[PDB]
Amino acid sequence: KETAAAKFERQHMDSSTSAASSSNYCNQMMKSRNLTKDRCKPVNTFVHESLADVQAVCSQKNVACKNGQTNCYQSYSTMSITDCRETGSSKYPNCAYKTTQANKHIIVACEGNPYVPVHFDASV
Template sequence: MKIQVVAVLLFALSATEICEALNFFQKHVVPQMAPGDCNTKMKVINEQKKKCKPINTFFLDPKGVLNGICNHGNKKPTMNIDLQIIDCKVDNKTYPDCTYKSVPGKATSVTVLCDQNKVPYHLEDVKRAGRK
């Protein structure tokens, strides 16, 4: 019986870690996205907190460059990248009818927060080409 309880607990912890990783990647990493897709993408994100998020950055990462960002043991890693991004900036803040304008750009580095299991859970900073 003890082994079954331990197995269930380990499974539950693993599921939580997987969900955290999926949440980070669902919120910020896509293989492709058209600038006009902000309203659709943000609707899913806004449903979690029942309000319009002011801004969200999506990395267009078809090759999975960001997949191993937490693999080096650093809780706040920065990775130099060369990825197209789309910033979705809120235009209408009336939930659930949030609307967004798209601002395409290019990211040169990204910093995330990683948990003790090397799972990214928060986008900390993005350096954009042409901005200081």
């Protein structure tokens, strides 16, 4: 089985680009990261920062999670992110996405020893 930490890296980390590469970014990335395999995942965020910087967020500002748990943390600095959101023309297996670039604070849930990001909660 894929670990929850590995799943977070696959679904949410893209350190290779500093921002949204192009208008095609989300279509390519959602496919290549296996996020359109069983259905079109309707929304997903990629973070363009190093793994170390995103793992560091687990010792930053503790905030309530959307599900009511207390294991969420908000980055003190803004981070470069790309939001992918499913379009109207999008029909499985031909999933289609709009690509938005932003610089926002991220909120992740952390678990484990070592204590690492496992879920992306929100950006603010």
